[PDB]
Design a binder for this molecule. Structure first.
Ligand SMILES: OC[C@H]1O[C@H](O[C@H]2[C@H](O)[C@@H](O)[C@@H](O)O[C@@H]2CO)[C@H](O)[C@@H](O)[C@@H]1O
Length: 369
């Protein structure tokens, strides 16, 4: 079903799909080959469906945690670029895209969450989570909440959990110990506990998705949020005054957000295996190609060494790096498919209050399998 001769590209609707579209015309200009850009839903789950029955895109863009899962199922393209090309990118980004001594994806960007605040409505930041229960009331004397952020997803709620020692899989002898999961440890339980007890005093709401958080800030209904560099485009153009800084201290310990790497590979069935390699190596990963993508919807700390240290200036990005290096990198193994949903469940359950904090989690230890 994958057609012989052309390119179709898959990337999420929060990154730059209008920036990556403009890059397509320079590729259509020289070689004459067609390059369509797309942004479907549940593409983390749609890809290993369409690929597992001989379909799907030429190229897919996502955090590196799924690609080891796609390398297991056997629906990827093993990339073999020259080592001189691997010398142009920060070496550690390849240690993400290497499941079992062999290559499967190019790295493009380095992601991490960072505290954004409404400099206008709230001048200085809180440095513990602990003071937000007092911070809420003062702004709630003007119809405005302290913090709001997507609670439904685990990516945003994990930073707070990890702080006090909350871990997916224990780091035992190079590889990851699957058999010791740590979502239901004493530190993690108390982390989640604080997210729930924030909500129980109406200082956040339980069912606040992504769209509500963004909009609420981007106009001004609330004075804080937790989001990536990708949301700086809409904030800038919605004309808000905002700094970026550290993700603050749960129990005098730093939030450890899971550090993703926006990476890309090619389909197993695909007949255009060297067509994407000429597109990837030459056009996109450049100080012209990564510019127009960063223009539309920022990536922050890019993987190509040359363009990264040209835009390392912005205190926003530096602060994004500060969180990132203080947090830890996402593991790549297959069960990271299952790990994310185990918590995704357990969070919402206790978040609203449907279940006890301890039961939802001590269940979710089982779910990671
Ligand atoms: O922790 C899992 C949770 O976060 C990540 O999703 C991120 C993704 O990493 C970013 O590149 C961007 O797309 O924002 C996403 C959240 O909306 C995980 O990759 C994914 O399992 C899940 O969303």
């Amino acid at each position: 079903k994958i057609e012989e001769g052309k390119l179709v590209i898959w990337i999420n609707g929060d990154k730059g799909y209008n920036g990556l579209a403009e890059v397509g015309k320079k590729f259509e200009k020289d070689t004459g080959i067609k390059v369509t850009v797309e942004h479907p839903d549940k593409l983390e789950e749609k890809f290993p469906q369409v690929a597992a029955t001989g379909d799907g895109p030429d190229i897919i863009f996502w955090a590196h945690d799924r690609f080891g899962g796609y390398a297991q199922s056997g629906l990827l393209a093993e990339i073999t670029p020259a080592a001189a090309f691997q010398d142009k990118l920060y070496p550690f980004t390849w240690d993400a895209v290497r499941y079992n001594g062999k290559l499967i994806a190019y790295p493009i960007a380095v992601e991490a969450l960072s505290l954004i605040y409404n400099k206008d409505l709230l001048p200085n930041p809180p440095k513990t989570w602990e003071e937000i229960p007092a911070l809420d009331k003062e702004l709630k004397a003007k119809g405005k909440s302290a913090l709001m952020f997507n609670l439904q997803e685990p990516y945003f709620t994990w930073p707070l959990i990890a702080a006090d020692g909350g871990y997916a899989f224990k780091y035992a002898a190079g590889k990851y110990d699957i058999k010791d999961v740590g979502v239901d440890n004493a530190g993690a339980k108390a982390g989640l506990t604080f997210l729930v007890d924030l909500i129980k005093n109406k200082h956040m709401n339980a069912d606040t998705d992504y769209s509500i958080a963004e909009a609420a800030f981007n106009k001004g209904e609330t004075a804080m949020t937790i989001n990536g560099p990708w949301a700086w485009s809409n904030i800038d153009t919605s004309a808000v005054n905002y700094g970026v800084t550290v993700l603050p201290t749960f129990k005098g310990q730093p939030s450890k957000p899971f550090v993703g790497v926006l990476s890309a590979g090619i389909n197993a069935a695909s007949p255009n295996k060297e067509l994407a390699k000429e597109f990837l190596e030459n056009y996109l990963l450049t100080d012209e190609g990564l510019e127009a993508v960063n223009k539309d919807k920022p990536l922050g700390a890019v993987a190509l060494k040359s363009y990264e240290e040209e835009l390392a200036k912005d205190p926003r990005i530096a602060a994004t790096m500060e969180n990132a290096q203080k947090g830890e990198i996402m593991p790549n193994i297959p069960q990271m498919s299952a790990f994310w949903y185990a918590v995704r469940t357990a969070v919402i359950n206790a978040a609203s209050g449907r279940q006890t904090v301890d039961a939802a989690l001590a269940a979710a230890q089982t779910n990671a399998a």
